[PDB]
Amino acid sequence: VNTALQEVLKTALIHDGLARGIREAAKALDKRQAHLCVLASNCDEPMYVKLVEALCAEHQINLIKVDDNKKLGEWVGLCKIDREGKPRKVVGCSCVVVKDYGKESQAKDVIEEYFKC
Amino acid sequence: MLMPKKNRIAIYELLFKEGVMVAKKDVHMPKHPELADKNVPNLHVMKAMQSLKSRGYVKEQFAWRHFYWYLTNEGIQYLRDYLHLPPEIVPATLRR
Amino acid sequence: HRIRITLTSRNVKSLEKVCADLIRGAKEKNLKVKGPVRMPTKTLRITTRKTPCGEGSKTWDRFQMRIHKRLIDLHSPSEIVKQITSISIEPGVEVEVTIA
Amino acid sequence: GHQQLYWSHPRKFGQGSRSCRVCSNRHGLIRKYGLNMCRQCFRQYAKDIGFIKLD
Amino acid sequence: KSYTTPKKNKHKRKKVKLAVLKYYKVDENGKISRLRRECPSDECGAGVFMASHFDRHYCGKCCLTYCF
Ligand SMILES: [Zn+2]
């Protein structure tokens, strides 16, 4: 499930369909364009856990969780200078939402049957 | 570089369909004739193109106003990496 | 019903030779034709200053262009005129098919 | 608001809207037949526009 | 290099933390709330939010100001 969701993130980054971030995530929530997102959990968030569970539990959004925040934005490319390898300066993410225009893939049927069952 | 993301994408796709772009060097002209489907000032187009010249993926030529950008094959690789498109489609200039 | 051909030339001897050869074509097809009319040439007047800046005696130059135009009337059907116009072309004369 | 402050001087007439078609200057333009050239660029481009000096 | 006249700056956005969460107040149960206004019109998008001034709300692009 994790590798398939990562390649969905990569293909949506290639297609420029995803809306990386949080304000534009709320924009997609208000436009009702939230189908899959990666939700942070058990992190050191002082007044953010209640609001992030509120925005994840808003309108037909997947219950996809991640262990930590700093490794979610490494795939997104928040400060990913020097594309051939690892950057010398990077800040992690909190939330990413995807709008898979190229939704159809080999593992997408497995992912939706995992979620819907 | 005060330019939107769609403007670079459309300019790069315009450079894919025709390999060399023409432009008139004047800042007092924001109604671009050669790209008329979208409103775009020519000043920011020439700023992005001199940025790409300082990158070093495309040539430079002058005919009294007329900046001619001759693209290289490694420049084709860099631009197709920027759009993240497969190299299956050849340039139309390369099509005989 | 009536047709006409207009021939504007930069040169003069090319104009005379092309018009004479088209008269010879109109006579080898043996058709009653109004002959060419020698329209006047235009004496072009451009006068500039040779000096880039201002110093000394002011010496000018007289620059002239030569343009020579003709009209020839035709009474022949138009397709033969198209066929004789599509052959014997030359770089420098933009031909016309006057219709009225 | 510099998009509407940029065209705060309209260009419709005068020598501010007209310039050379070769070297882009605003002195001594040729308005004969819409050449829109200055004198010296016309002088160095007079040989290749089909010209002989006669009188 | 420098002028004897003083210089006035330009509107630079400073280091601001926890601002957009001010548009989502933490309530008791699962009620989607809103403390400030939005566009009733559509020339500004639904994700565009109003300002909180002394007596009026200002739209991001449309500049349609409605006072109280
Ligand atoms: Zn609005």
UniProtKB/Swiss-Prot annotation, chain A:
The modification N6-succinyllysine is found at residue 116. Its main location: cytoplasm. Keywords: Acetylation, Cytoplasm, Nucleus, Ribonucleoprotein, Ribosomal protein. It is found in: Cytoplasm; Nucleus, Nucleolus. Pfam families: Ribosomal_L7Ae. GO terms for biological process: positive regulation of canonical Wnt signaling pathway; ribosomal small subunit biogenesis; translation. InterPro entries: Ribosomal_eL30-like_sf, Ribosomal_eL8/eL30/eS12/Gad45, Ribosomal_eS12, Ribosomal_eS12_CS. Part of the small subunit (SSU) processome, composed of more than 70 proteins and the RNA chaperone small nucleolar RNA (snoRNA) U3. Subunit of the 40S ribosomal complex. Part of the small subunit (SSU) processome, first precursor of the small eukaryotic ribosomal subunit. During the assembly of the SSU processome in the nucleolus, many ribosome biogenesis factors, an RNA chaperone and ribosomal proteins associate with the nascent pre-rRNA and work in concert to generate RNA folding, modifications, rearrangements and cleavage as well as targeted degradation of pre-ribosomal RNA by the RNA exosome. Subunit of the 40S ribosomal complex. Belongs to the eukaryotic ribosomal protein eS12 family. This is Small ribosomal subunit protein eS12. It comes from Oryctolagus cuniculus. The lineage of its organism: Eukaryota, Metazoa, Chordata, Craniata, Vertebrata.
From Swiss-Prot, chain C:
Signal peptide: none annotated. It is found in: Cytoplasm. Keywords: Acetylation, Cytoplasm, Isopeptide bond, Phosphoprotein, Ribonucleoprotein, Ribosomal protein, Ubl conjugation. It comes from the Eukaryota. The modification N6-acetyllysine is found at residues 17, 58. One of its GO terms (molecular function) is structural constituent of ribosome. Polyubiquitinated by ZNF598 via 'Lys-63'-linked ubiquitin chains when a ribosome has stalled, initiating the ribosome quality control (RQC) pathway to degrade the potentially detrimental aberrant nascent polypeptide. Deubiquitinated by OTUD3 and USP21, antagonizing ZNF598 activity. Ufmylated by UFL1. The modification Phosphoserine is found at residue 76. GO terms for cellular component: cytosolic ribosome; small ribosomal subunit. One of its GO terms (biological process) is translation. Belongs to the universal ribosomal protein uS10 family. Component of the 40S small ribosomal subunit. Component of the small ribosomal subunit. The ribosome is a large ribonucleoprotein complex responsible for the synthesis of proteins in the cell. This is Small ribosomal subunit protein uS10. The lineage of its organism: Eukaryota, Metazoa, Chordata, Craniata, Vertebrata. The chain holds residues 18 to 117 of 119 of the full protein.
Swiss-Prot record, chain D:
GO terms for biological process: cytoplasmic translation. The modification Phosphoserine is found at residue 8. The modification N6-acetyllysine is found at residue 47. One of its GO terms (cellular component) is rough endoplasmic reticulum. The keyword Endoplasmic reticulum applies. Pfam families: Ribosomal_S14. One of its GO terms (molecular function) is zinc ion binding. The keyword Ribosomal protein applies. It is found in: Cytoplasm, Cytosol; Cytoplasm; Rough endoplasmic reticulum. Keywords: Acetylation, Cytoplasm, Endoplasmic reticulum, Metal-binding, Methylation, Phosphoprotein, Ribonucleoprotein, Ribosomal protein, Zinc. The modification Omega-N-methylarginine is found at residue 11. Its main location: cytoplasm. Belongs to the universal ribosomal protein uS14 family. PANTHER family: 40S RIBOSOMAL PROTEIN S29, SMALL RIBOSOMAL SUBUNIT PROTEIN US14. Component of the 40S small ribosomal subunit. NCBIfam families: PRK05766.1. Component of the small ribosomal subunit. The ribosome is a large ribonucleoprotein complex responsible for the synthesis of proteins in the cell. This is Small ribosomal subunit protein uS14. It comes from Oryctolagus cuniculus (Rabbit).
UniProtKB/Swiss-Prot annotation, chain E:
Residues 1-13 are annotated as: Disordered. It is found in: Cytoplasm; Nucleus, Nucleolus. The modification N6-acetyllysine is found at residues 22, 31. Component of the 40S subunit of the ribosome. Part of the small subunit (SSU) processome, first precursor of the small eukaryotic ribosomal subunit. During the assembly of the SSU processome in the nucleolus, many ribosome biogenesis factors, an RNA chaperone and ribosomal proteins associate with the nascent pre-rRNA and work in concert to generate RNA folding, modifications, rearrangements and cleavage as well as targeted degradation of pre-ribosomal RNA by the RNA exosome. A zinc finger (C4-type) spans 39-62. The gene is RPS27A. There is a cross-link at residues 25, 31 (Glycyl lysine isopeptide (Lys-Gly) (interchain with G-Cter in ubiquitin)). This is Small ribosomal subunit protein eS31. Monoubiquitinated at Lys-25 and Lys-31 by RNF25 in response to ribosome collisions (ribosome stalling): ubiquitination promotes subsequent activation of RNF14, leading to EEF1A1 ubiquitination and degradation and rescue of stalled ribosomes. Deubiquitination at Lys-31 by USP16 is required for maturation of the 40S ribosomal complex. Part of the 40S ribosomal subunit. Part of the small subunit (SSU) processome, composed of more than 70 proteins and the RNA chaperone small nucleolar RNA (snoRNA) U3.
